[PDB]
Protein backbone atom coordinates (compact mmCIF):
# COMPACT_ATOMS: atom_id res chain seq x y z
CA UNK A 1 0.00 0.00 0.00
CA UNK A 2 1.22 3.25 1.52
CA UNK A 3 5.02 3.41 1.70
CA UNK A 4 7.19 6.51 1.47
CA UNK A 5 9.56 4.77 -0.95
CA UNK A 6 7.89 4.50 -4.38
CA UNK A 7 10.03 1.49 -5.31
CA UNK A 8 8.65 -0.35 -2.30
CA UNK A 9 5.16 0.81 -3.26
CA UNK A 10 5.53 -0.58 -6.77
CA UNK A 11 6.36 -4.11 -5.61
CA UNK A 12 3.82 -4.12 -2.80
CA UNK A 13 1.12 -3.10 -5.27
CA UNK A 14 1.57 -6.32 -7.27
CA UNK A 15 1.11 -8.53 -4.20
CA UNK A 16 -1.77 -6.87 -2.38
CA UNK A 17 -4.57 -9.45 -2.28
CA UNK A 18 -4.55 -13.09 -3.35
CA UNK A 19 -2.43 -13.94 -6.41
CA UNK A 20 -2.91 -17.18 -8.42
CA UNK A 21 0.17 -19.35 -8.86
CA UNK A 22 1.13 -21.84 -11.56
CA UNK A 23 4.13 -24.15 -11.09
CA UNK A 24 5.57 -26.26 -13.89
CA UNK A 25 8.58 -28.52 -13.40
CA UNK A 26 10.37 -30.85 -15.82
CA UNK A 27 12.75 -33.23 -14.12
CA UNK A 28 15.24 -35.98 -14.85
CA UNK A 29 16.72 -37.90 -11.89
CA UNK A 30 19.10 -40.73 -12.82
CA UNK A 31 17.29 -40.85 -16.17
CA UNK A 32 13.80 -41.16 -14.66
CA UNK A 33 12.02 -38.31 -16.49
CA UNK A 34 8.99 -36.76 -14.83
CA UNK A 35 6.88 -33.64 -14.86
CA UNK A 36 4.99 -31.84 -12.10
CA UNK A 37 2.25 -29.22 -12.43
CA UNK A 38 0.99 -27.17 -9.50
CA UNK A 39 -1.77 -24.64 -8.94
CA UNK A 40 -2.81 -22.52 -6.03
CA UNK A 41 -2.70 -19.06 -4.55
CA UNK A 42 -0.39 -16.83 -2.54
CA UNK A 43 -1.21 -14.12 -0.01
CA UNK A 44 1.91 -12.13 0.79
CA UNK A 45 0.08 -10.13 3.49
CA UNK A 46 0.18 -13.25 5.66
CA UNK A 47 3.16 -14.95 4.03
CA UNK A 48 0.81 -17.75 3.05
CA UNK A 49 0.89 -20.15 0.10
CA UNK A 50 -1.62 -22.91 -0.66
CA UNK A 51 -0.66 -25.21 -3.53
CA UNK A 52 -1.56 -28.60 -4.92
CA UNK A 53 0.96 -30.43 -7.10
CA UNK A 54 0.37 -33.36 -9.45
CA UNK A 55 2.88 -35.61 -11.09
CA UNK A 56 1.63 -35.61 -14.69
CA UNK A 57 3.85 -38.48 -15.95
CA UNK A 58 2.71 -41.12 -13.43
CA UNK A 59 4.42 -42.01 -10.15
CA UNK A 60 6.92 -39.47 -8.87
CA UNK A 61 10.34 -41.22 -8.81
CA UNK A 62 11.59 -39.20 -5.81
CA UNK A 63 9.86 -38.40 -2.50
CA UNK A 64 7.60 -35.33 -2.55
CA UNK A 65 9.30 -33.70 0.48
CA UNK A 66 12.59 -33.46 -1.45
CA UNK A 67 10.90 -31.11 -3.96
CA UNK A 68 9.29 -28.67 -1.52
CA UNK A 69 12.03 -26.07 -1.65
CA UNK A 70 12.25 -26.32 -5.47
CA UNK A 71 8.47 -26.08 -6.14
CA UNK A 72 8.16 -18.81 -4.73
CA UNK A 73 9.76 -16.49 -2.18
CA UNK A 74 8.04 -13.35 -3.47
CA UNK A 75 5.08 -14.44 -1.28
CA UNK A 76 7.11 -14.03 1.92
CA UNK A 77 5.71 -11.60 4.47
CA UNK A 78 8.21 -8.80 5.00
CA UNK A 79 7.39 -6.65 8.02
CA UNK A 80 6.82 -2.98 7.29
CA UNK A 81 10.20 -1.92 8.68
CA UNK A 82 11.95 -4.47 6.43
CA UNK A 83 10.15 -3.86 3.12
CA UNK A 84 13.17 -2.05 1.70
CA UNK A 85 14.96 -5.46 1.83
CA UNK A 86 12.46 -7.44 -0.28
CA UNK A 87 14.48 -8.35 -3.37
CA UNK A 88 11.91 -10.87 -4.54
CA UNK A 89 9.01 -8.48 -5.04
CA UNK A 90 11.28 -5.68 -6.35
CA UNK A 91 12.26 -7.82 -9.33
CA UNK A 92 8.64 -8.15 -10.46
CA UNK A 93 6.84 -8.25 -12.79
CA UNK A 94 9.79 -9.07 -15.09
CA UNK A 95 10.92 -11.64 -12.52
CA UNK A 96 14.02 -13.41 -11.37
CA UNK A 97 16.02 -16.56 -11.93
CA UNK A 98 16.48 -18.90 -8.96
CA UNK A 99 19.29 -21.46 -9.26
CA UNK A 100 20.17 -24.14 -6.76
CA UNK A 101 22.41 -27.09 -6.21
CA UNK A 102 21.07 -29.42 -3.54
CA UNK A 103 23.49 -32.02 -2.17
CA UNK A 104 21.91 -35.01 -0.42
CA UNK A 105 24.48 -36.25 2.09
CA UNK A 106 25.84 -39.67 1.07
CA UNK A 107 23.64 -39.55 -2.03
CA UNK A 108 23.05 -37.64 -5.29
CA UNK A 109 22.43 -33.99 -6.07
CA UNK A 110 19.72 -31.90 -7.71
CA UNK A 111 20.57 -28.94 -9.91
CA UNK A 112 17.62 -26.62 -10.53
CA UNK A 113 17.01 -23.53 -12.59
CA UNK A 114 13.74 -21.67 -12.38
CA UNK A 115 12.22 -18.50 -13.77
CA UNK A 116 9.67 -16.76 -11.57
CA UNK A 117 7.65 -14.04 -13.23
CA UNK A 118 4.14 -12.80 -13.94
CA UNK A 119 2.16 -13.96 -16.99
CA UNK A 120 -0.76 -11.56 -16.85
CA UNK A 121 -2.23 -11.80 -13.37
CA UNK A 122 -0.67 -15.21 -12.67
CA UNK A 123 2.63 -15.76 -10.91
CA UNK A 124 4.44 -18.56 -12.75
CA UNK A 125 7.35 -20.65 -11.50
CA UNK A 126 8.94 -22.62 -14.39
CA UNK A 127 11.58 -25.11 -13.25
CA UNK A 128 14.09 -27.50 -14.81
CA UNK A 129 15.58 -30.11 -12.48
CA UNK A 130 18.49 -32.44 -13.16
CA UNK A 131 19.42 -35.05 -10.60
CA UNK A 132 22.56 -37.22 -10.82
CA UNK A 133 24.60 -39.73 -8.81
CA UNK A 134 21.72 -41.07 -6.69
CA UNK A 135 21.87 -44.55 -5.19
CA UNK A 136 19.04 -46.78 -6.43
CA UNK A 137 18.76 -48.17 -2.88
CA UNK A 138 19.23 -44.87 -1.07
CA UNK A 139 16.74 -42.86 0.89
CA UNK A 140 15.67 -40.87 -2.17
CA UNK A 141 15.20 -43.35 -4.98
CA UNK A 142 14.26 -45.94 -2.34
CA UNK A 143 11.40 -43.76 -0.95
CA UNK A 144 12.45 -43.98 2.68
CA UNK A 145 11.49 -40.44 3.71
CA UNK A 146 8.53 -39.59 5.86
CA UNK A 147 5.82 -37.45 4.35
CA UNK A 148 6.39 -34.32 6.42
CA UNK A 149 8.58 -31.16 6.62
CA UNK A 150 10.36 -29.45 9.55
CA UNK A 151 10.35 -25.68 10.19
CA UNK A 152 13.68 -23.91 9.63
CA UNK A 153 15.22 -20.46 9.26
CA UNK A 154 17.30 -19.46 6.26
CA UNK A 155 19.79 -16.63 5.95
CA UNK A 156 19.64 -14.32 2.91
CA UNK A 157 22.66 -12.22 1.82
CA UNK A 158 23.13 -9.76 -0.98
CA UNK A 159 25.36 -10.61 -3.91
CA UNK A 160 26.13 -7.06 -5.02
CA UNK A 161 28.19 -8.16 -8.04
CA UNK A 162 25.29 -10.13 -9.51
CA UNK A 163 22.70 -7.51 -8.49
CA UNK A 164 21.06 -10.40 -6.63
CA UNK A 165 21.08 -12.59 -3.57
CA UNK A 166 22.62 -15.78 -2.33
CA UNK A 167 21.76 -18.21 0.41
CA UNK A 168 23.06 -21.49 1.74
CA UNK A 169 21.07 -23.64 4.15
CA UNK A 170 20.41 -27.16 5.36
CA UNK A 171 17.11 -29.06 5.22
CA UNK A 172 16.75 -32.17 7.39
CA UNK A 173 14.40 -34.77 5.98
CA UNK A 174 13.00 -37.36 8.35
CA UNK A 175 13.75 -41.01 7.39
CA UNK A 176 11.13 -43.60 8.22
CA UNK A 177 13.46 -45.24 10.79
CA UNK A 178 13.80 -42.05 12.83
CA UNK A 179 17.10 -40.90 11.38
CA UNK A 180 17.63 -37.84 9.18
CA UNK A 181 18.67 -37.24 5.58
CA UNK A 182 20.54 -33.94 5.17
CA UNK A 183 19.96 -31.78 2.09
CA UNK A 184 22.57 -28.99 1.71
CA UNK A 185 21.15 -26.17 -0.43
CA UNK A 186 23.16 -23.54 -2.32
CA UNK A 187 21.01 -20.85 -3.88
CA UNK A 188 21.46 -17.76 -6.02
CA UNK A 189 18.85 -15.42 -7.48
CA UNK A 190 19.31 -12.79 -10.17
CA UNK A 191 16.87 -10.39 -11.82
CA UNK A 192 15.58 -11.03 -15.31
CA UNK A 193 15.04 -7.37 -16.09
CA UNK A 194 17.61 -4.60 -16.36
CA UNK A 195 15.96 -2.15 -13.96
CA UNK A 196 16.86 -1.51 -10.36
CA UNK A 197 16.15 -3.94 -7.54
CA UNK A 198 16.30 -3.77 -3.77
CA UNK A 199 19.44 -5.38 -2.43
CA UNK A 200 18.90 -6.50 1.17
CA UNK A 201 20.90 -6.27 4.32
CA UNK A 202 21.47 -9.69 5.82
CA UNK A 203 18.28 -11.17 7.30
CA UNK A 204 16.48 -14.50 7.51
CA UNK A 205 13.27 -16.14 6.38
CA UNK A 206 11.36 -18.31 8.83
CA UNK A 207 9.52 -21.12 7.03
CA UNK A 208 6.94 -23.65 8.11
CA UNK A 209 5.32 -26.17 5.78
CA UNK A 210 2.48 -28.67 6.20
CA UNK A 211 2.10 -31.52 3.70
CA UNK A 212 -1.19 -33.29 3.16
CA UNK A 213 -3.16 -35.38 0.67
CA UNK A 214 -6.40 -34.76 -1.19
CA UNK A 215 -8.65 -37.72 -0.28
CA UNK A 216 -10.41 -37.56 -3.68
CA UNK A 217 -7.22 -37.46 -5.80
CA UNK A 218 -6.02 -40.69 -7.47
CA UNK A 219 -3.00 -39.14 -9.15
CA UNK A 220 0.34 -38.93 -7.34
CA UNK A 221 0.20 -35.52 -5.66
CA UNK A 222 1.14 -33.26 -2.75
CA UNK A 223 -0.94 -30.59 -1.02
CA UNK A 224 1.23 -27.92 0.51
CA UNK A 225 0.51 -25.11 2.96
CA UNK A 226 3.58 -22.91 3.46
CA UNK A 227 4.18 -19.84 5.60
CA UNK A 228 7.28 -17.70 5.11
CA UNK A 229 8.12 -14.62 7.22
CA UNK A 230 11.12 -12.34 7.09
CA UNK A 231 12.84 -11.38 10.34
CA UNK A 232 16.23 -10.51 11.82
CA UNK A 233 16.33 -6.73 11.56
CA UNK A 234 14.92 -4.92 14.56
CA UNK A 235 12.59 -1.92 14.44
CA UNK A 236 13.48 0.15 17.50
Swiss-Prot record:
Changing residue 72 to N: In R10-3; matures to the red-emitting state with excitation and emission maxima at 555 and 585 nm, respectively. It holds the Pfam family GFP. Changing residue 159 to V: In EBFP2.0; shifts the excitation and emission spectra to shorter wavelengths and increases quantum yields compared to BFP. Changing residue 202 to I: In mut2.1; shifts fluorescence lifetime from 3.03 to 2.50 ns. Keywords: Chromophore, Luminescence, Photoprotein. Changing residue 157 to T: Increases fluorescence at warmer temperatures such as 37 degrees Celsius. This is Green fluorescent protein.
